[PDB]
Structures are given as structure tokens and as C-alpha cells.
Amino acid sequence: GNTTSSVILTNYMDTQYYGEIGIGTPPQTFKVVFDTGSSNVWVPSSKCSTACVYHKLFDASDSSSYKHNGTELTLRYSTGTVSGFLSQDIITVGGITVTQMFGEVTEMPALPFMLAEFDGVVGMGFIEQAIGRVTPIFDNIISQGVLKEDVFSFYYNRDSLGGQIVLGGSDPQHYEGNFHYINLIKTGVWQIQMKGVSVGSSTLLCEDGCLALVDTGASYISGSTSSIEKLMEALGAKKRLFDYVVKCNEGPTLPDISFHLGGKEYTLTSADYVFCTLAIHAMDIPPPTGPTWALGATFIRKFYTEFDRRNNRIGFALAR
Numbered sequence: 132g133n134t135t136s137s138v139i140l141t142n143y144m145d146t147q148y149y150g151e152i153g154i155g156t157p158p159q160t161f162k163v164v165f166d167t168g169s170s171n172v173w174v175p176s177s178k179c180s181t182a183c184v185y186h187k188l189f190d191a192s193d194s195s196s197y198k199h200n201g202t203e204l205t206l207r208y209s210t211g212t213v214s215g216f217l218s219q220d221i222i223t224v225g226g227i228t229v230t231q232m233f234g235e236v237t238e239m240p241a242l243p244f245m246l247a248e249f250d251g252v253v254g255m256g257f258i259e260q261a262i263g264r265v266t267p268i269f270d271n272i273i274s275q276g277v278l279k280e281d282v283f284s285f286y287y288n289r290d291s292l293g294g295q296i297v298l299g300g301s302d303p304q305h306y307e308g309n310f311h312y313i314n315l316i317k318t319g320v321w322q323i324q325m326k327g328v329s330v331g332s333s334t335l336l337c338e339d340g341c342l343a344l345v346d347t348g349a350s351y352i353s354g355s356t357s358s359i360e361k362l363m364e365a366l367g368a369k370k371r372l373f374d375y376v377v378k379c380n381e382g383p384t385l386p387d388i389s390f391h392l393g394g395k396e397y398t399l400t401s402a403d404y405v406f407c408t409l410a411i412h413a414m415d416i417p418p419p420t421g422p423t424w425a426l427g428a429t430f431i432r433k434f435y436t437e438f439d440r441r442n443n444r445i446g447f448a449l450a451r
């Protein structure tokens with residue numbers, strides 16, 4: 132029984148990578164985002180009034196293992212806000228069935244959520260980021276002692292699979308070379324320490340230290356406005372006008388962008404962030420978590436990442 136489950140993901144235009152999870156007995160299948168940036172799991176309930184219309188609704192009277200809770204919770208995002216109440220039931224993810232407390236969403240905003248191919252979220256975060264300190268699912272599936280190693284990996288594919296999360300190990304057919312691990316700067320968050328950004332073979336941003344949160348939930352690579360407009364400057368630019376847009380003739384032409392992460396240099400070439408829209412955006416993130424950089428999808432695409440709970444580090448390997 133020393134396990135490894137695999138969940139294959141759908142790639143909704145390099146911006147949304149999502150999966151399927153089953154909730155209850157028997158399972159209601161939901162499409163969800165796996166997010167190292169959040170710590171609560173939520174889905175819309177059949178108690179929902181808006182964009183409830185458009186997504187699968189969780190219905191407790193079809194589950195033999197539901198044990199209601201009812202406590203409120205409002206989960207707030209840089210994009211959304213959602214609220215409901217706490218429910219309890221059985222989640223099934225790639226063949227791990229764990230008993231989870233999760234929020235049954237009763238109010239969803241009609242704009243960001245309407246055009247979201249996903250129904251809810253499973254956060255891959257630390258108990259410390261949990262609203263209500265509801266034991267996040269990974270602490271919980273580790274408690275069950277079924278996995279090979281208390282690590283989970285992610286493959287984000289370029290828009291034949293779309294992507295893939297492996298719990299308990301890593302998938303060698305999808306990375307090449309070897310992992311180099313960087314340690315969490317402080318537990319509670321999946322954040323490492325960055326030593327600069329070479330926006331050339333020369334520019335240098337954060338030639339000091341700056342923080343970098345490894346966030347699966349994020350679609351782009353982000354930095355603070357301040358930081359991001361110096362970087363966009365020394366590159367091609369064209370401020371705003373539906374978000375940092377450059378010349379297409381000189382796309383191939385743009386320089387490399389390198390992150391100095393614990394020793395090695397992680398560089399992405401023009402072809403990894405130029406779509407013409409650029410895959411880099413700004414997002415001043417507030418204390419506690421901000422001010423930080425956010426290596427989201429755009430980064431993962433290029434680097435297969437391993438999040439290690441037993442040693443609280445992050446390893447990366449060349450994706451393939």
C-alpha cells in the first residue's frame with residue numbers, strides 16, 4: 132500500500148488547469164483547481180440562489196456520509212469572494228478517500244465566476260491559511276498514512292493531456308534531469324526566497340532578496356506594480372492596453388528572464404511568456420503574504436515542481 136495517485140488535468144487556455152474530485156457517497160464529480168495559494172476546499176451547494184446556474188451544485192440529500200456543520204465562512208480572493216457554510220463528507224481524489232470539512236458555497240459573484248470552467252477549489256496550502264483553521268486536505272490525506280512520501284507534484288502542459296498532479300510522488304515521464312530543492316522561508320506558506328531577476332544577461336530586480344510564492348492557482352508570473360513596470364520597461368513594454376502587449380515581429384527577439392532560486396538560475400525564454408500578450412502581470416499582494424512575487428502557471432509550465440511537506444522545501448526540474 133505505499134501509494135501514489137494521479138489526477139489528470141484539463142488545460143483551459145494556459146490560464147486554467149483543473150481536475151475532477153468526487154464528494155460523498157456515491158460521488159458527485161466536481162471540476163476543481165488545485166491551489167498552493169489557498170487552504171480551504173469549496174464547491175457550490177444546491178442551496179445556491181448568479182453563476183450557480185452554470186456549475187455543478189453539491190447535493191447533500193444524495194450522500195450517506197454527509198454530517199452537516201453549518202458554521203459560516205466567507206473565502207476572499209484577489210479575483211473573487213465566496214461564502215457559505217461548512218459541510219463534512221468524503222472526498223475521493225485520484226483514489227484516496229479522505230474525510231474533509233469543506234464549504235458549501237451559497238453565494239458566488241456573477242462576474243469572475245461565470246466564466247470559470249471550474250466548480251470549486253481544493254487548496255494545497257498550510258493549516259495557517261485556512262479560514263476557520265479547517266484542516267486542509269493534504270494534512271488530512273497524510274494523516275491516513277497511505278502515501279509513499281508526503282509530497283505532491285504538478286505538470287502544467289502547453290496549450291496531450293493538459294496537465295497533471297501526482298500525490299505521493301513525481302512522474303518521471305514528465306520531468307527531465309534532477310530536482311534542485313529550495314527551502315520554505317517560513318512554514319504556513321509555500322514561499323521561497325528569491326535572489327534577483329535578470330531581465331537580460333544584465334537587468335537585476337530584487338538584487339537583494341524578494342519573496343516568491345509558488346502558486347499553482349495563478350495563471351501568470353506576478354510581481355508588484357512597481358517591480359513589474361521596470362521589468363516591462365527594459366523589454367518591449369506597451370503599458371496596459373489589455374495587459375502588457377508587445378510587438379509581434381520582435382517576439383523571438385525578446386531577451387530571457389531569469390529567477391535566481393536557491394543557487395540555480397531558472398530561465399524562461401521569450402517563447403514561454405510571450406503568447407501579442409505577455410504572460411507576466413503585476414499584483415501587489417498584501418502583508419501578511421505579500422509583498423511578494425508569484426510564480427504561477429507560466430512558471431510551472433517550464434518547471435515541473437515538487438512541493439515537499441516532510442522537509443518543507445520545493446524542488447523543480449525541467450518539465451517535458
Ligand SMILES: *[C@@H]1O[C@H](CO)[C@@H](O)[C@H](O)[C@H]1NC(C)=O
Pocket residue numbers: 199200201202217263264265
Ligand atoms: C463544525 O466545525 C467547526 C470547525 O471549525 C466546529 O468548531 C463547530 O463546532 C462544528 N459545528 C458543529 C455543530 O458540529
